């Protein structure tokens, strides 16, 4: 087993991105080891929609995409095939026929500040309901009425982003969580991510 697939650069990363501007890293031409993620660590949730956690070192695909971001505590159930809310509607939509895994662990020591963390925003006030695996990073005043908003906020013109306020005393339902989503793709091509 000469080569090896870098997962410590996706999990043990210092800056870990935001929900409305989530980061994606393509993985290929490696030999991944899934016996160090399932059978280790402190991951609170390890849900594998599609295929099961075991027998994951057998199947091998063409590409794997890792999506990393940060959300609240009671907002991790909205990352699932289906589901409706405010994150699965305006920030990150997940297709109904999904093959992959969802991982999240409580990172409260690293993403909490006395007074409030001013990073980690999330999108609010959108028109449509987004599409699977689609990002939007535009910051334009949300026009909620007939009268146009000429770049100035006021009545029926709102900023489309709200800031998570993270403090070291918020209760488990509001503490930050770090989420990583792996997506397995077999698209009519020779595989390059085959296991040990």
């Amino acid at each position: 087993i000469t080569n090896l697939c870098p997962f410590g650069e996706v999990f043990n990363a210092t800056r870990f991105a935001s929900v409305y501007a989530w980061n994606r890293k393509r993985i290929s031409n490696c030999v991944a080891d899934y016996s160090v993620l399932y059978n280790s660590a402190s991951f609170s949730t390890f849900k594998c929609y599609g295929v099961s956690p075991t027998k994951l070192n057998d199947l091998c695909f063409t590409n794997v995409y890792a999506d990393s971001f940060v959300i609240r505590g009671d907002e991790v159930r909205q990352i699932a095939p289906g589901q409706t809310g405010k994150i699965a509607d305006y920030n990150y939509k997940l297709p109904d026929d999904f093959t992959g895994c969802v991982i999240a662990w409580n990172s409260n020591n690293l993403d909490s500040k006395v007074g409030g963390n001013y990073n980690y925003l999330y999108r609010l006030f959108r028109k449509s309901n987004l599409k699977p695996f689609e990002r939007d990073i535009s910051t334009e005043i949300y026009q909620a009425g007939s009268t146009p908003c000429n770049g100035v906020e006021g009545f029926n013109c709102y900023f489309p982003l709200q800031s998570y306020g993270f403090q070291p005393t918020n209760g488990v339902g509001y503490q930050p969580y770090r989420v990583v989503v792996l997506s397995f793709e077999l698209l009519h091509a020779p595989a390059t991510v085959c296991g040990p």
């Epitope: 609010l124 006030f125 028109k127 909620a144 009425g145 007939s146 009268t147 006021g154 009545f155 029926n156 709102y158 900023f159 709200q162």
Partner: antibody
Framework: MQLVQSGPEVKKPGTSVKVSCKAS????????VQWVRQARGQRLEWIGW????????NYAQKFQERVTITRDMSTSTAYMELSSLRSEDTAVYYC????????????????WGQGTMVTVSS | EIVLTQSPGTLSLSPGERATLSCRAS???????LAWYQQKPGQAPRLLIY???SRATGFPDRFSGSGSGTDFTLTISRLEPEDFAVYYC?????????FGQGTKVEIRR
């Protein structure tokens, strides 16, 4: 199509008071609620407004360090608190909000409350 | 806008006379951020025209409306009964928002 308020109250000078305004019949999530004031035989006055979604609030200059307006997204109810009551605050308080169905919203405050008489004295 | 002025203070004439409320104001204010109201005694204000020209649903015909930089007005083409009340202005496009003084229409007897 309603903004039902609380009942009348009679307070004492120096205390505080909270007034409710519950919405029904429209999507309260995307709207805005403003508060006004009127005495007996006098003209209307403005207090402040709050965005129901974001929660941002703006107050008048004379009511700035006396009034706080909360959100209470669940159950679709908005409040307002007045501190350090004086004998000149005997008035009727209203709440108004536009009609919103889905993402689109009305261009003005068409839904109005029913009033809440507040008397403060010895 | 920080102060609004409503003139004339009061009007009074028998039914069937066109009336022109005027709401001349301070430096400037955008259109489509001004509205009119009506309050009968012991009631809550209703919404009249809500864009300086766009009329509300409940009220019937005969209620017009104009607007400009500093001369807003409201013309009622006939003073038929159940239309004698107090009408207010408001601008909500420049904080802090403000109201006019209001003008009470009367009946000559």
């Amino acid at each position: 199509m309603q903004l039902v308020q609380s009942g009348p109250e009679v307070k004492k000078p120096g205390t505080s008071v909270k007034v409710s305004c519950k919405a029904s019949g429209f999507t309260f999530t995307s709207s805005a609620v403003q508060w006004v004031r009127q005495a007996r035989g006098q003209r209307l006055e403005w207090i402040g407004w709050i965005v129901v979604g974001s929660g941002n609030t703006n107050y008048a200059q004379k009511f700035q360090e006396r009034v706080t307006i909360t959100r209470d997204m669940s159950t679709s109810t908005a409040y307002m608190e007045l501190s350090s009551l004086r004998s000149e605050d005997t008035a009727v308080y209203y709440c108004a909000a536009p009609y919103c169905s889905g993402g689109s919203c009305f261009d003005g405050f068409d839904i109005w409350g029913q009033g809440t008489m507040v008397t403060v004295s010895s | 806008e920080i102060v609004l002025t409503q003139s004339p203070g009061t009007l009074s004439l028998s039914p069937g006379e066109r009336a022109t409320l005027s709401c001349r104001a301070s430096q400037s204010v955008s259109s489509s951020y001004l509205a009119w109201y009506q309050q009968k005694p012991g009631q809550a204000p209703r919404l009249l025209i809500y864009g300086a020209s766009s009329r509300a649903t409940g009220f019937p015909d005969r209620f017009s409306g104009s607007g400009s930089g500093t001369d807003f007005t409201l013309t009622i083409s006939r003073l038929e009964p159940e239309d004698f009340a107090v009408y207010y202005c408001q601008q909500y496009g420049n904080s802090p928002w403000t109201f006019g003084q209001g003008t009470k229409v009367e009946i000559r007897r």
